[PDB]
Design a protein around this ligand. Structure first.
Ligand SMILES: NC(=O)c1ccc[n+]([C@@H]2O[C@H](COP(=O)([O-])OP(=O)(O)OC[C@H]3O[C@@H](n4cnc5c(N)ncnc54)[C@H](O)[C@@H]3O)[C@@H](O)[C@H]2O)c1
Ligand SMILES: CCCC[S@@H](O)c1sc2nc(-c3nccs3)cc(-c3cnc(C)n3C)c2c1N
Length: 259
């Protein structure tokens, strides 16, 4: 009943972890707006979901989340079409240390923009019913990566932002909980980007160190990450939680020594 009948918006939903989230949420009874900048992947994804689940339970919107006008229009569309917003998953992201400025815009700036749009629609102080926002970070949000310093920067920023916005929500009595998920390696297109100079820039020569870490720890499949998302949504005690998901230690929250 925490998911059933709710409306979710998932960015980066065309493939990888985003699609896995959409499938898990549809199975739990949600309506899902799939939001992605890749029109062709998006159409393929919705067409496949339309075979499994009911067509009216999904909407596909093409949107570059880093474009604030497109993002604002996307939100408006979702709420017009489904009549409310209950669950926001800021999941879109890239790996690109060469055009690292753009990586920050997609990975960090867009998570903040999306979060604040979600709060605009969902906060009880703005006429909403409350809700949950889940931001995708990474284990790279908690630990350093020599070959991906700007990705690391962006994923650390998501952690700081989400912990902070969760405390602000309590203060503002918005009735919105904000949590983040920090997966280890997951079997998606993004893993392939480490092979590419276009993505790695000056770090390409050291790509094998990442490969050795992959070998060391192993790779999750997207559907296992989705279980984690469902836990966050179902447990309404969870606010400001940083959920780690790895093969080595499972599903565990980050502990912090706060004052
Ligand atoms: N796969 C991993 O090992 C791993 C580990 C930890 C965190 N993550 C994070 O998980 C999230 C999902 O990535 P994934 O591994 O499923 O990769 P993926 O590349 O398969 O999926 C990312 C999706 O986001 C979309 N997207 C990218 N930039 C966009 C933008 N500007 N606007 C709209 N959509 C955009 C892409 O088109 C794609 O469909 C990302 O935030 C990524 O950083 C991945
Ligand atoms: C294209 C790269 C996308 C994957 S990143 O988000 C990512 S996920 C990940 N997971 C882990 C895990 N540690 C324990 C269990 S799984 C480690 C890394 C990583 C890679 N290189 C280092 C030093 N680290 C910490 C990384 C890392 N760089």
């Amino acid at each position: 009943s925490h998911v059933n009948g709710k409306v979710a918006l998932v960015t980066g939903a065309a493939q990888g972890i985003g699609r896995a989230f959409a499938e898990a949420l549809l199975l739990k009874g949600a309506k899902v707006a799939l939001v992605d900048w890749n029109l062709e992947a998006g159409v393929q994804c919705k067409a496949a979901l339309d075979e499994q689940f009911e067509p009216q339970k999904t909407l596909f919107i093409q949107c570059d989340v880093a474009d604030q006008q497109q993002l604002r229009d996307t939100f408006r569309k979702v709420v017009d079409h489904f009549g409310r917003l209950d669950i926001l998953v800021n999941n879109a992201g890239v790996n690109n240390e060469k055009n690292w400025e753009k990586t920050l815009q997609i990975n960090l700036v867009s998570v903040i923009s999306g979060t604040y749009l979600g709060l605009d629609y969902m906060s009880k102080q703005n006429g909403g019913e409350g809700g949950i926002i889940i931001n995708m970070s990474s284990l790279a949000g908690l630990m350093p990566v020599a070959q991906q310093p700007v990705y690391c920067a962006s994923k650390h920023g998501i952690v700081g932002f989400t912990r902070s916005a969760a405390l602000a929500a309590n203060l503002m009595n918005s009735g919105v909980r904000l949590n983040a998920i920090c997966p280890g390696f997951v079997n998606t297109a993004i893993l392939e980007s480490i092979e590419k100079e276009e993505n790695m820039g000056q770090y390409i020569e050291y790509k094998d160190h990442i490969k050795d870490m992959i070998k060391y720890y192993g790779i999750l499949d997207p559907p296992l990450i989705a279980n984690g998302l469902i836990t966050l949504i179902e447990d309404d005690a969870l606010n400001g939680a940083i959920m780690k998901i790895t093969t080595s230690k499972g599903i565990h929250f980050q502990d912090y020594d706060t004052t």
